[PDB]
Design a binder for this molecule. Structure first.
Ligand SMILES: *[C@@H]1O[C@H](CO)[C@@H](O)[C@H](O)[C@H]1NC(C)=O
Ligand SMILES: *[C@@H]1O[C@H](CO)[C@@H](O)[C@H](O)[C@H]1NC(C)=O
Ligand SMILES: *[C@@H]1O[C@H](CO)[C@@H](O)[C@H](O)[C@H]1NC(C)=O
Ligand SMILES: *[C@@H]1O[C@H](CO)[C@@H](O)[C@H](O)[C@H]1NC(C)=O
Lengths: 189, 189, 189, 189
C-alpha cells in the first residue's frame, strides 16, 4: 500500500489549503482518491491524481478520512490496496471553547492535573490537543449546572510542563472543529 | 523538530518589521511556513524559505500562530515534525491602557507586587510583558466603575527590579494588540 | 502519442452524452485531459482518467478542442506527447439552416453537386457533415437577399449516393452549433 | 542542472492553469524559481517550491521564460545551475487572425504551399503552429494594401498532409498570444 501524508498540516483552518501527498514504491505514483468519512464530496469520488492532490480552499465538507490506491498495472485489479487512513480536520467553524485548569495552571511535580473545556455552544465532543503531540484526546461533552457543555480531562500526575488547546464539535461532524481555545500553559514545579 | 524564533521580537509594532528565523539540526534548513489560526497573507501563502524570512512592513493580517517543518528528504514525510510555536503579535492598533502598581513602584524585597491594567476600552484580554523576559502573561478583563475594564496580575514575591508594560486585546483577535502602556519600572529595595 | 476519439460522436447534441476515449500503446492508459481553446468545465478541470470518461448531459461549455497525454512513467516528462485533436461540438443551440442541392437531389454519375446552406440567422461559419463520414467541411457565411446568410459547398464529381446535413455557428464560438438541417440525400444514377 | 517541464501544456489559455514540474537527481527536489522574460512577477521572485509549482489562474503576466535552480546543499553555492529554459505561452488575449492557403488548402505532392495570417489587429509578430510539431515558427507582421497586418509562411514542397493554426502578438509580449486561427487542414494529393 502507498504512504499518504497531508502537507503541510492535516489540521487546516477554514478557507485554508491542504495537499494530499502519496508515495508508492511498488507501482507508479498515479493514485485514486477515496473519501471514507465526513460530508460526501462528489468531485472527490474516484478522482485520479498524479503524485499530489491540492484541496483549496478547504471547506467543512473536506473534513474526514481519506484513502488512496496506487496504480499497479500488472496486478489482478491494476490498482493496489488502500493507503493508510488520512484524517483531515477543519478548524475555526464555531466559537472557541474556554480551557481552564484544576487546581491551577501551575502545580508541583507528581500532582494530578485536570483540564476543562467549557462553552455555551452545544458541542457533542471536546478534543484536547497538546503542543508537540499529534495524538488528540477526545471526550464527550456533558451539560453542567451553569448552562454550559463541559468535559474534564484528567491528565494524572505531572511529569513535565505542557501547553494545551481544545476544540468543540457537533454530532455527525467529528473532524469539523471550532476555533481553538486560548493556549493554556501547564507549568510543573 | 526545528527551532523557530522571531527577531528582533515576536511582539512587533504595526508598520514595523519582523524576521521569521528557523534552524534544523537533523536535516536541511529549508522551511515550510503555515499559519494555524487562519489563512495566511499572500506573501506567506505557500511559503517555503531558506534559513530566515523578512516581513516589512508588518500589518494586522500577520498576527497569529505559525509552525515550520524543516526539510528532511530521507524520511516518509520528507519533512520534519512541527516546530516550536512561532507567534506574531501586532501592536499599536488601539489606545494604550494605563498600568498601575500595588503597593507602588518601589517595594521591599520579598513583598507582593500586583500590577493593574486598566482602560476605558472594552478589551477582553490584557497582556503583561516585561523588559528582558520574552514571556508574556495573559489575563481576562473585568468590568468596574468608572466604566472601565481591568485586570490584576499578581507576580508574587518581588526579587529584583523589573520594568513592565501591558497591552489590550479584544475577544476575537488575541494576537492583535493595542498600543503599549507607559512603562512601569518596579524597584526592589 | 495516444489515440483519442469521441464516442458515439464528436458532434453531440446539447443534453446528449459523449465519451472521451483514449488508448496508448507505448505506455499506460492513464490519460490527462486539457482544453486548448479555453478553461474547462469543473468536472474536466484537473481531469486524469482511466481508459475512457463519460460526459452526460452535454452542455455548451463542453464544446472545444482537447488533448490527452498517456502515462509514460520512464521518460523525462513522465508523460507522452499530445494526442490527436479531440474535438467536441455541441448542437441544437440555434434554429436549423435550410440545405439545398444543385442541380438537385438526383444527379448523374461524375456530375458536380453544390450544396447551399442558407439561414435568416447571421451565422459566421457553416459546417457540412455527411452520414457515415466523420469528416466535417467548414465554410464562411455570405450575405444575400432575402436578408439571408449562405454558404456553397462544391463537392466536385458525384461518385456515390450520400446524405448530408449542415450546421450554423457564430464567429466567437466555432464549436457551438445550431440544430441540424433537414437531411438531404443525394442520389447518383 | 534540473529538468523542468510544463504540465499539462506550456501553451495555456487565459484563465487556465499550468504546473511547473522539476526533477533533480544530483541534489534534492527543492527548487527556486526564476522568471527571465515577460512581465515582471514579484510573487515569483526567488520563490522556493517543492517538486512542483502551480500557477493558477494564468494571466498574461505569466507568459515568458522560466528557469529553476535545484537545492544542492553540499556545493559552493548550495544551489545548482539553472535548469533548461521553460517558455510559458498565454493564448486567447486578442482577436484571432485569419489563416489562408496559397494556392489552396488542397494541392498535389511536390507543390509549394504558402500560408498567410491576416488581421485588423496591429500584431507585430505572427506565430504559425502545426498539429504534431512543438516547434513554432515566427515571422514579422507586415502591413498590406488592404489595411491588414499580414505574414506569409512559405512551407515549400509538400511531403504530407498537415494542419495549421496561427497566433498574433504585439511588441514586447512575444509569449502573449491572441486567439488561435480556425484550423487550416492542408491536404496533399
Ligand atoms: C491522583 O489520583 C490518583 C487516583 O485517584 C491517586 O491515587 C493519587 O494519589 C492522586 N495524586 C495526588 C497527588 O493527589
Ligand atoms: C503574597 O503572594 C504569595 C504568592 O503569591 C502568597 O503565598 C502570599 O500569601 C501573599 N501574601 C499576601 C499578604 O498577599
Ligand atoms: C466540376 O468540378 C470539377 C472539380 O471541382 C471542376 O474541375 C470542373 O470544372 C467542374 N465543372 C463544372 C461544369 O462546374
Ligand atoms: C518551389 O519554389 C522553389 C524556389 O523558387 C522552386 O525551385 C520550385 O520549382 C518550386 N516548386 C514548384 C512546384 O513550383
Amino acid at each position: 500500500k502507498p504512504f499518504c501524508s497531508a502537507w503541510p498540516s492535516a489540521v487546516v483552518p477554514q478557507g485554508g489549503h491542504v495537499t494530499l501527498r502519496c508515495h508508492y514504491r511498488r507501482g507508479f505514483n498515479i493514485f485514486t482518491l477515496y473519501k471514507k468519512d465526513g460530508v460526501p464530496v462528489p468531485e472527490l469520488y474516484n478522482r485520479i491524481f498524479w503524485n499530489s492532490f491540492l484541496i483549496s480552499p478547504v471547506t467543512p465538507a473536506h473534513a474526514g478520512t481519506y484513502r488512496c490506491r496506487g496504480f499497479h498495472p500488472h496486478s489482478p485489479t491494476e490498482w493496489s490496496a488502500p493507503s493508510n487512513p488520512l484524517v483531515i480536520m477543519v478548524t475555526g467553524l464555531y466559537e472557541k471553547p474556554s480551557l481552564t485548569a484544576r487546581p491551577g495552571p501551575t502545580v508541583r511535580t507528581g500532582e494530578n492535573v485536570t483540564l476543562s473545556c467549557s462553552s455555551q455552544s452545544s458541542f457533542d465532543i471536546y478534543h484536547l490537543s497538546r503542543e508537540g503531540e499529534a495524538h488528540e484526546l477526545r471526550l464527550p461533552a456533558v451539560p453542567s449546572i451553569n448552562g454550559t457543555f463541559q468535559a474534564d480531562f484528567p491528565l494524572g500526575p505531572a511529569t513535565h510542563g505542557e501547553t494545551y488547546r481544545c476544540f468543540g464539535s457537533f454530532h455527525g461532524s467529528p473532524y469539523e472543529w471550532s476555533d481553538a481555545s486560548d493556549p493554556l500553559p501547564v507549568s510543573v514545579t
